[PDB]
Amino acid sequence: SYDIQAWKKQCEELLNLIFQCEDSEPFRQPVDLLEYPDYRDIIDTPMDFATVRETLEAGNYESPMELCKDVRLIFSNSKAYTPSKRSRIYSMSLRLSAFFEEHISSVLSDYKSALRFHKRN
Numbered sequence: 001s002y003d004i005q006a007w008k009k010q011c012e013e014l015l016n017l018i019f020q021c022e023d024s025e026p027f028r029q030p031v032d033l034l035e036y037p038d039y040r041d042i043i044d045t046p047m048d049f050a051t052v053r054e055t056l057e058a059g060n061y062e063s064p065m066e067l068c069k070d071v072r073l074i075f076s077n078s079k080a081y082t083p084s085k086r087s088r089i090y091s092m093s094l095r096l097s098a099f100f101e102e103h104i105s106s107v108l109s110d111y112k113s114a115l116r117f118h119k120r121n
């Protein structure tokens with residue numbers, strides 16, 4: 001497809017699949033700073049899947065690359081906060097990241113292809 005707008009619905013669908021994954025539980029909503037009092041000493045930019053979905057539905061992503069940068073920030077924040085590479089919540093993050101990367105690959109390729117076709121002449 002050379003549809004320049006198709007990525008948006010494709011990302012809505014993929015966020016729906018991520019919300020059905022039990023591995024997304026810890027990442028749907030912001031970290032609570034009463035249960036994790038040192039979070040903002042470690043993490044400069046919090047991110048979660050509900051913020052990603054709201055930013056998409058507001059029309060505040062210009063490309064699936066921007067959405068991808070914010071989802072990758074969810075996963076790098078988990079890696080930066082984990083006291084161990086064997087922790088439950090970090091382990092959930094690695095499986096969810098693999099799922100996300102497997103599915104976003106074609107969304108990015110199709111978008112970049114569609115832009116190149118738009119500028120073909």
Ligand SMILES: O=C(Nc1ccccc1Cl)N1CCN(C(=O)c2ccco2)CC1
Pocket residue numbers: 025026027029030031032035036077078079081082083087089090
């Ligand atoms: O509290 C968290 N998420 C959450 C938010 C609202 C309701 C319910 C939940 Cl589980 N989080 C814990 C901190 N964290 C980590 O990535 C991490 C890595 C090693 C330990 O925690 C991010 C998710």
